[PDB]
Amino acid sequence: PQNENARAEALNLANTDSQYLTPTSGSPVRGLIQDHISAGVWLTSKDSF
Amino acid sequence: NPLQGVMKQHLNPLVMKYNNKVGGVVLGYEGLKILDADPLSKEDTSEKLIKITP
Amino acid sequence: VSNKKIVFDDEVSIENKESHKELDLPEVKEDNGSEIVYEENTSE
Amino acid sequence: PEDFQQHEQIRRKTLKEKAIPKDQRATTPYMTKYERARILGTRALQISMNAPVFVDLEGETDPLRIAMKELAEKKIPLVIRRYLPDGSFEDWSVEELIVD
Amino acid sequence: GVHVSYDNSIRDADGTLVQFMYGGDAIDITKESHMTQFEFCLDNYYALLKKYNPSALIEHLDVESALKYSKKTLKYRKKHSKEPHYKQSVKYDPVLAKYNPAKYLGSVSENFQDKLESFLDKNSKLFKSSDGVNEKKFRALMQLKYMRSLINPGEAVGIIASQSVGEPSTQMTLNTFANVTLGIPRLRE
Amino acid sequence: LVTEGVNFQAMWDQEAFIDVDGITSNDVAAVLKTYGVEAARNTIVNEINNVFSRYAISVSFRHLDLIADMMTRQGTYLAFNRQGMETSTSSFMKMSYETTCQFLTKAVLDNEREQLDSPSARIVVGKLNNVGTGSFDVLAKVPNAA
Amino acid sequence: MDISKPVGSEITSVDFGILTAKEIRNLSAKQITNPTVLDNLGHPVSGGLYDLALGAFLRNLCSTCGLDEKFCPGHQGHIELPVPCYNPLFFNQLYIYLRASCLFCHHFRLKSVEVHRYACKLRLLQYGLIDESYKLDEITLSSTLLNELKSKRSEYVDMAIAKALSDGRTTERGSFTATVNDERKKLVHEFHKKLLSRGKCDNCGMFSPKFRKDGFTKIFETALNEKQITNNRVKGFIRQDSTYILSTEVKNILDTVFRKEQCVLQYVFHSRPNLSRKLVKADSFFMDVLVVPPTRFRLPSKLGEEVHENSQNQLLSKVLTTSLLIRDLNDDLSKLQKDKVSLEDRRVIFSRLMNAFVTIQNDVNAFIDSTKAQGRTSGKVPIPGVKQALEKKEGLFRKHMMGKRVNYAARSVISPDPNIETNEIGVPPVFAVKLTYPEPVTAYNIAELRQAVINGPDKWPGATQIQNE
Amino acid sequence: ENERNISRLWRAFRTVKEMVKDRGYFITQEEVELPLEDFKAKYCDSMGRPQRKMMSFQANPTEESISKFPDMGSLWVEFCDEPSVGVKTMKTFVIHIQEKNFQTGIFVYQNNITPSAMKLVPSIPPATIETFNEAALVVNITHHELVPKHIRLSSDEKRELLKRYRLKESQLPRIQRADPVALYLGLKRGEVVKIIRKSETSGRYASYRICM
Amino acid sequence: YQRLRHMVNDKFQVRSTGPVNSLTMQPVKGRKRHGGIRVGEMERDALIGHGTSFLLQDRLLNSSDYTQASVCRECGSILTTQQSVPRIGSISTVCCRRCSMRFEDAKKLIFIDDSQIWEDGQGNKFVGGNETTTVAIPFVLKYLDSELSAMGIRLRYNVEPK
Ligand SMILES: [Zn+2]
Ligand SMILES: [Zn+2]
Ligand SMILES: [Zn+2]
């Protein structure tokens, strides 16, 4: 985008962080997957020091 | 400085040139007034609205 | 008319097609930085 | 010449008929997410072309960031004109709207 | 061009009024998740109070009018509770019909009003084993939450509804194995 | 109980076995004819919701209500096809949907004015959109104006 | 688009209408008359389709404004059609009114009283007065009664509009919503159905011969049937106080009908009140001239190295030849003395005239809507007319207005990266160096932009150019 | 075996009373809830067959109605005894309506109104006339779960609605003049109905439609 | 392990500006010739759905076929204006061919001011047609208007201020 009005809109209205919940049902669309889930189960285990 | 700006941008350049609309040479000008875009204000006040281009 | 038009269209079609056959097309750039392309076909 | 005067009087009259006076305002006292973005962009545009700035830059070079700063201190001299669907409108100053 | 207007109604671009209020309740779907998550809001009360900052709005909101009207209607709606829907009292329209949810604290959907009051009613326990949060204060905060979950004037709800039906329907391109018409064919019918 | 086929009046005679006040249908147009537009509206909402519920897809009734209110805006059962579209006040929007020269021919013969309110029309003429950030005007407060 | 070139004037609405041959002639930069486009040295033929009055072409300067191929916006010219043609876009509507006409009393064959009832309703709908248009139908208290009925309906419409204007409900510009537009469209449909549904004229009682068409815009007139010729001469005393039919005959018939039935037509052809006060004319359905669009919209193409003529020019030159040819038929036609002109020569002259009209009408059709043109030299495949240009594939509107190819963008295969933020995008330098942004220079950023300009086009973060004041 | 037929007539009668009450006229609650037996008692001969002519009745506006709708006239309901409706019977009915000065006539026919007689419907302004078939009154559609409560607005209520939303009449959502509920409430063009919906989202929710 | 051949013309592309198409003045299709990337109908709807009217304006106007063009405020056309051709020393002005009289015809019907006459390149003199300004339109609008006038159809743009 090529002018500050369009900048402001892309950073405040259509920006990724503005779109955590979907408008379909109002639920999350962004999260971590694969390695990151497996990693979490391990890092947050009681056995972890 | 809106009055200053209207003067330096538009009016001053008209001085001592022929102008097609008044059908003569413009010698000069008096009593410049901005029309407030807020139609509810008094012709008095020195705070006025000017609509900005999209 | 229609019968005369046949002959007249033929010789004009031939004439016009040959004229264009050795035409020379000159580049036109905008202030933008933009060549203007002579093509009649948005083939997208 | 006589009738341009008339034309102007009609324009100005209908404009006044459309304006909803301050104390009869009825829309949300909150700044909308749309109003915010445009206010920022537009004020940023004016900053980029040497509008007098009402806040300390403190090294900032992004005019959008300067606007944001101005917004934060409520020093943006802009007014939002909200249109109801019949074309009548309410003027709300940026400073008076609750921002979030 | 169907969008939310500054009067909370939903209009087409030519001014034609399509709905009088977005969900019958003016709520943004993407601000809705925690509106009836009361126990999550009661823990976390203090952070929510910081976030919503009631101090900055006292001068700009009517804090009495809608609450008073709300009680008037809760009475009539209960006094005529068990009688069938066509013999219903219509002396009193819902609060949202009369008071702008953005301006009047307490102007709130009746579902929400009920869900909230039921919670407060059935959970007096949590208002002692709380951090000093009393029943009154929590109602107010939840009411303020509703206010801050409103759809914004300007939203292209029409485009969004279209996408919320078209996009998810791509998951119905195939099928499993009454006897009725299903999936996309039906959606077309 | 569930019937293949629709005939409300016939069912109205079986008052002895069924609660006639709670009979519902698949068929939006049948309901419209017998019970009216509000009933038909509800039937549309439920039917569209039934479509998604079967595939465990969740879609807010807020969208569904709007779609159904739209469809019933003329007191009737209007589809999102040529006929429903044909009513729209915007000739530029119709021109950009289906059959440009037809809608254009219609506009000319009506000596129509495009008021430029639809998103389509404004894109055609290069006008800032009416929705969102285009739904209001911005004005500058300037001092020293007398 | 440049934030330092603001625009003060703003377009607020668009009005649809029809170009008159008078306007066109006045605005035209050149009348085009030569089918031939170039000469042996590749220069524009004067009076031809690349005539320099229509705009700069190749290395030549525009003869109208003097600007070159870059700053010259182009200018329109016109072709003079030697004989009126039906405008193919409107031929169906023309057909409706023609059929509906009474070729004797020159009203529509629908009874005047009914036609007036439609005029009343449509007029009310210009002001959005839907309830009133139904109330209009509620009005009743043989030719003496009818004029009082007409009169009292008329005074109702006036009273309703007056009342509607005094309170909020309308302006002199009308009121136009979807529900209004729906009621309007129904009425016009109902009106047209009723127009064509009449045989004998309800007003003078005569029968007019029936009109039949082509898909190629030709009109035939079927002469009168036996019972009907009998019926017609019985009414002979009261009035006392197949074949191709030329477009000129058709125009004369409609010209008169449009004068007589002007009242109703004034509302059938205007969805809003007609403040302009212009009459509704039959000419609107005909073309006496064709607008030749500016040269920049009709340029040749290069398919690699070979150069191909513009297809719209190929169609226009066919209009041009037929045009010259008819101007010759018209020349020999005047050199006939009627003292040698037979009764049999009457048939042959007509034969030649029908021929001319048909083929000019075909050449016009071919240029505007190739569908309505007779398939050429069985093969070749038709050359697109204007309709087909606007409607090619998804069509101009969808392919170049609702969606566009744009400047300042890039495309690439995507690759995963866990090391950027969830709200970032990792941009390859190959893009970063070619995509620019126009930053205005100020006190607060002069340091930064100095460095960018020093860095140049190829060292990031740099700059590719400077815009001066 | 006319036991059904009588029951169906008893049922259609109930709907008519309910309809007339809903329109604003004074009808007792006990009158609506007339038990099946009492109905035969009052309206059948000693023969078991039902006498339609005895069923016909007059209705006057109530207290609230007179205040809200000053020009609400009196209403007359007719149950034609004849399987088909002659133009003879129609006239007799219409005369009755005009002579004794009623604002509304409701004609409850059994199955056939000759289109000859349908002509006489708008014959006596300012008064208005409505027709209903019996078999379509066996059930009260407004009692249905899917049919929200429609309330007719007064001219004052309508003026206020249009002002509050700055609306032109035709920008409102439409309800067809011949919509089953419109016909039930006797809606004239231009009248606005307030509709109290149950929302899945909100509780009660007021919407409106204009009759065109 | 097997290495799979490329089946696809993968290669990336970027365009700031570059060649435009003659009729629409919109970016040509290309890659190998600096073509633009398409924002089509689906992306239009997305941009409306966000409420981002400036992003929409940036893509479908500003960064595509944005054009400052002359209109006649009087007849509402964008096709009948041209630059005047002035005598040497005088400055060129913007005039409407529809709204002005051929000089002869105007004489043939009070004195006529000097500022009211203009000339073209051929040499014909005109009286009037000086009510012009500039408006910002997508170029493709000019093409559409042009095609429509071929079909005998007139678009009339109402411009403000008058
Ligand atoms: Zn030129
Ligand atoms: Zn006649
Ligand atoms: Zn002009």
Tab-separated table of all heavy atoms in Angstrom, chain I residues 72-77 80 96-99 129, ligand 3:
chain	number	residue	atom	x	y	z
I	72	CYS	N	-16.225	18.519	-18.304
I	72	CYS	CA	-17.012	19.728	-18.454
I	72	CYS	C	-18.119	19.703	-17.406
I	72	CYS	O	-19.006	18.854	-17.428
I	72	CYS	CB	-17.598	19.832	-19.868
I	72	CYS	SG	-18.713	21.216	-20.101
I	73	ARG	N	-18.041	20.642	-16.478
I	73	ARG	CA	-19.034	20.820	-15.437
I	73	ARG	C	-20.412	21.082	-16.031
I	73	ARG	O	-21.428	20.949	-15.359
I	73	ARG	CB	-18.622	22.012	-14.567
I	73	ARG	CG	-18.544	21.724	-13.079
I	73	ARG	CD	-18.374	22.995	-12.263
I	73	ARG	NE	-16.980	23.409	-12.156
I	73	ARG	CZ	-16.469	24.443	-12.808
I	73	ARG	NH1	-17.251	25.155	-13.611
I	73	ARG	NH2	-15.185	24.768	-12.652
I	74	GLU	N	-20.450	21.464	-17.300
I	74	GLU	CA	-21.679	21.973	-17.890
I	74	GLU	C	-22.495	20.885	-18.565
I	74	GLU	O	-23.707	20.836	-18.389
I	74	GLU	CB	-21.334	23.069	-18.885
I	74	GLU	CG	-22.464	23.991	-19.289
I	74	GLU	CD	-22.007	25.043	-20.307
I	74	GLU	OE1	-20.797	25.370	-20.336
I	74	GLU	OE2	-22.855	25.529	-21.089
I	75	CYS	N	-21.832	20.029	-19.347
I	75	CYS	CA	-22.482	18.881	-19.989
I	75	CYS	C	-22.177	17.558	-19.287
I	75	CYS	O	-22.750	16.532	-19.623
I	75	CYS	CB	-22.048	18.759	-21.451
I	75	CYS	SG	-20.330	18.318	-21.768
I	76	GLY	N	-21.234	17.588	-18.349
I	76	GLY	CA	-20.854	16.416	-17.588
I	76	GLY	C	-20.132	15.349	-18.383
I	76	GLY	O	-20.312	14.159	-18.117
I	77	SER	N	-19.317	15.749	-19.351
I	77	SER	CA	-18.564	14.765	-20.119
I	77	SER	C	-17.071	14.783	-19.799
I	77	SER	O	-16.543	15.793	-19.332
I	77	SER	CB	-18.769	14.955	-21.619
I	77	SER	OG	-17.746	14.279	-22.339
I	80	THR	N	-15.224	15.158	-24.237
I	80	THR	CA	-15.380	16.262	-25.174
I	80	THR	C	-14.534	17.457	-24.786
I	80	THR	O	-14.714	18.544	-25.312
I	80	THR	CB	-16.828	16.747	-25.241
I	80	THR	OG1	-17.275	17.059	-23.916
I	80	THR	CG2	-17.709	15.689	-25.850
I	96	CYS	N	-14.474	22.585	-23.696
I	96	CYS	CA	-15.415	21.543	-24.090
I	96	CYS	C	-15.943	21.720	-25.500
I	96	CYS	O	-16.605	22.708	-25.791
I	96	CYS	CB	-16.619	21.487	-23.129
I	96	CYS	SG	-17.922	20.297	-23.654
I	97	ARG	N	-15.696	20.743	-26.363
I	97	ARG	CA	-16.187	20.814	-27.730
I	97	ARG	C	-17.708	20.737	-27.828
I	97	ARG	O	-18.271	21.148	-28.824
I	97	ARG	CB	-15.566	19.718	-28.594
I	97	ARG	CG	-14.104	19.895	-28.907
I	97	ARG	CD	-13.727	18.931	-30.021
I	97	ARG	NE	-12.752	19.485	-30.952
I	97	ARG	CZ	-13.063	19.964	-32.148
I	97	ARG	NH1	-14.332	19.969	-32.554
I	97	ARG	NH2	-12.106	20.430	-32.935
I	98	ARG	N	-18.388	20.208	-26.823
I	98	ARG	CA	-19.840	20.083	-26.942
I	98	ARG	C	-20.540	21.396	-26.643
I	98	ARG	O	-21.524	21.749	-27.293
I	98	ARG	CB	-20.410	18.988	-26.022
I	98	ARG	CG	-21.943	18.905	-26.029
I	98	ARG	CD	-22.509	18.101	-24.870
I	98	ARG	NE	-22.763	16.703	-25.223
I	98	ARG	CZ	-21.982	15.672	-24.901
I	98	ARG	NH1	-20.873	15.836	-24.195
I	98	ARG	NH2	-22.317	14.456	-25.289
I	99	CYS	N	-20.035	22.100	-25.641
I	99	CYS	CA	-20.722	23.246	-25.068
I	99	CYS	C	-20.361	24.580	-25.731
I	99	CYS	O	-20.821	25.648	-25.304
I	99	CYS	CB	-20.436	23.323	-23.563
I	99	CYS	SG	-21.182	22.002	-22.640
I	129	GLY	N	-17.593	27.173	-23.609
I	129	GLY	CA	-17.098	25.865	-23.212
I	129	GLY	C	-15.951	25.893	-22.221
I	129	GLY	O	-15.048	25.057	-22.290
J	3	ZN	ZN	-19.582	20.487	-22.093
